[PDB]
Amino acid sequence: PEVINSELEAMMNIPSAMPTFQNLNVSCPSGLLLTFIGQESTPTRNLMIRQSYPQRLKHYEFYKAVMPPLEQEASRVVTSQGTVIKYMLDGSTQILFADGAVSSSPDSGPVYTSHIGTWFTTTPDGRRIGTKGLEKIEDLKPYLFFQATDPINGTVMTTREDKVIIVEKKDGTRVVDHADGTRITTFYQVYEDHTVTRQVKCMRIESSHYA
């Protein structure tokens, strides 16, 4: 932060004779860009990690005819609670949650206007909710889902019609792999305070081309 010298500026007018959080930027030789962003909660800030490919935004059309539309991502950002917010190269936005819910928006405008954004939300049990601003889209067929349970350890599977598999164990660990290959594991890790052994919720996000 500099100071503008008022006297120096007041000289140049010759009369005519006529920050709170520092972001760390990390990059991979494969082209992946990583940035740590500290979002202030509306001190305790919530750390949020943004991953993107700058070359995919520049040469959008080359990659459009090379990699599948499901992987045509411009940027993805991971919350401290697990909401993977994906930016696809065509301007749409896809949202992946830790409970199996998937949100999409082809125009990706505002959700609720108190441009008009069209949003589609698929609940983990298969029900679909779609809205275009204030009007709700009806006749949305829910995705068929099936449930299989391990009879030995009691671990319960559920794969939805959109290839969204949900893995839930008896210890509270939830593993969700979406259609795009991104896996969100809601596992747990004990923490010892210096002793008391406390319940510190953790998680893991895995993707074949992202950190």
């Binding site: 099936f146 299989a148 599977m157 794969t159 019609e161 959109d162 290839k163 598999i165």
Partner: protein, 169 residues
């Protein structure tokens, strides 16, 4: 989306197709199995027979087992039926349907999905239906959607001579 192994071609028919070595008798056995008429009398049956003939001649190397074979084979037939089910454009919907049934044939989860194809193979299968049946989609749409040139006969009642104002009386 359902497992379509031996949905249309069984192991006996596929033994017959595998014993066929040349393309011509392959097409003949297909037309026998496809219940298609002679290709010379109907162009639609000729197109379908050519599609399934290039189905048999291609997949004859790198290797799908007769199981994965009949799987992808019924895949192509089922999406043909789905695409020709309506005359309106349904490229994206049929695309999503094909990909859903694809992952039904690529993911291991009985009794709704079987680990029949490999990952290289499954990406290749994705590469199939993308890469004519949604660009030649207009060709098959024109062929197998009861034509886009329909006739009409009109019978409408015109204006009878309206009763003019009677002369002043």
């Amino acid at each position: 989306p359902r497992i379509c192994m031996w949905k249309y071609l069984d192991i006996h028919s596929m033994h017959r197709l595998e014993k066929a070595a040349t393309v011509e008798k392959m097409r003949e056995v297909l037309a026998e199995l496809l219940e298609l008429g002679f290709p010379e009398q109907s162009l639609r049956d000729a197109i379908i027979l050519d599609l399934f003939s290039h189905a048999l001649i291609f997949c004859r190397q790198q290797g799908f087992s007769p199981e994965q074979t009949s799987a992808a084979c019924a895949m192509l037939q089922d999406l043909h039926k789905a695409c020709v089910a309506t005359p309106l454009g349904n490229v994206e919907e049929c695309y999503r349907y094909f990909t859903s049934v694809l992952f039904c044939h690529g993911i291991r989860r009985p009794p709704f999905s079987i680990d029949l194809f490999k990952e290289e193979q499954l990406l290749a299968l994705a590469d199939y239906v993308v890469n004519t049946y949604f660009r030649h989609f207009k060709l098959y749409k024109y062929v197998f959607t009861p034509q886009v040139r329909l006739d009409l006969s009109l019978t409408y009642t015109g204006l009878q001579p309206l009763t003019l104002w009677p002369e002043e009386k």
